[PDB]
Design a protein around this ligand. Structure first.
Ligand SMILES: O[C@@H]1[C@@H](O)[C@H](O[C@@H]2CO[C@@H](O[C@@H]3CO[C@@H](O)[C@H](O)[C@H]3O)[C@H](O)[C@H]2O)OC[C@H]1O
Ligand SMILES: O[C@@H]1[C@@H](O)[C@H](O[C@@H]2CO[C@@H](O[C@@H]3CO[C@@H](O)[C@H](O)[C@H]3O)[C@H](O)[C@H]2O)OC[C@H]1O
Ligand SMILES: [Zn+2]
Length: 185
């Protein structure tokens, strides 16, 4: 399935110059930002999708994540599979680990309160994370075998919602500057 979804969200802080490139390609150049999320992927997420990407540029200066990023409803859950980051490795309530695609990821949960989501500007929701224990090398074709994460989460009592929303390979930033260039398929 070729990508069909363009995610381009900013809370309005700083500069987020995002380019919707040809096919699965996008880029972001950002400066002194609030929170933003830019990426490409699919209108409807699947627990069985293999996400492929190649980050030809991964150059955060401060907090950025290079991450699978997506949502379900029923219930409302945000999830991440974080392959690389900048100055900050995201963590939460430690649940366990999962091995996938040549890496080991820690599994965490967090909760957001009064926060933006696909449902509104001020919402409360759980987040599920796989965060790689070390930054993944970038520049070569990489795979996220999402089933492995979903199954590990499930085994730790972290069940996703029944109603799948979008699923993207994203650049998320907070209080940072940077450059990224990623192709997704
Ligand atoms: O940042 C940019 C990189 O993402 C880009 O890398 C290329 C991304 O596309 C890859 O081609 C895929 C190979 O596998 C096939 O099954 C897919 O259908 C193709 O799309 C290619 O191999 C990568 O080199 O390079 C340019 C950077 O700016
Ligand atoms: O049109 C609607 C959009 O406005 C809506 O935007 C979402 C807003 O919330 C964003 O998620 C936050 C940023 O990412 C993480 O840091 C946080 O946990 C979230 O608070 C999300 O990226 C946007 O998609 O999406 C739905 C549309 O109907
Ligand atoms: Zn386990």
């Amino acid at each position: 399935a070729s990508t069909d979804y363009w995610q381009n969200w900013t809370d309005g802080g700083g500069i987020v110059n995002a380019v919707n490139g040809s096919g699965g390609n996008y880029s972001v150049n950002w400066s002194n930002t609030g929170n933003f999320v830019v990426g490409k992927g699919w209108t409807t997420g699947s627990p069985f999708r293999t996400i492929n990407y190649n980050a030809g540029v991964w150059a955060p200066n401060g907090n950025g994540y290079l991450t699978l990023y997506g949502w379900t409803r029923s219930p409302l859950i945000q999830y991440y599979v974080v392959d690389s980051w900048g100055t900050y490795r995201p963590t939460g309530t430690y649940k366990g680990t999962v091995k996938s695609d040549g890496g080991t990821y820690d599994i965490y949960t967090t909760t957001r309160y009064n926060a933006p989501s696909i449902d509104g500007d001020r919402t409360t929701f759980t987040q599920y994370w796989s965060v790689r224990q070390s930054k993944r090398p970038t520049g070569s074709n990489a795979t996220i075998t999402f089933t492995n994460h979903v199954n590990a989460w499930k085994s730790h009592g972290m069940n996703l919602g029944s109603n799948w929303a979008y699923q993207v390979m994203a650049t998320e930033g907070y209080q940072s500057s940077g450059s990224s260039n990623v192709t997704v398929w």
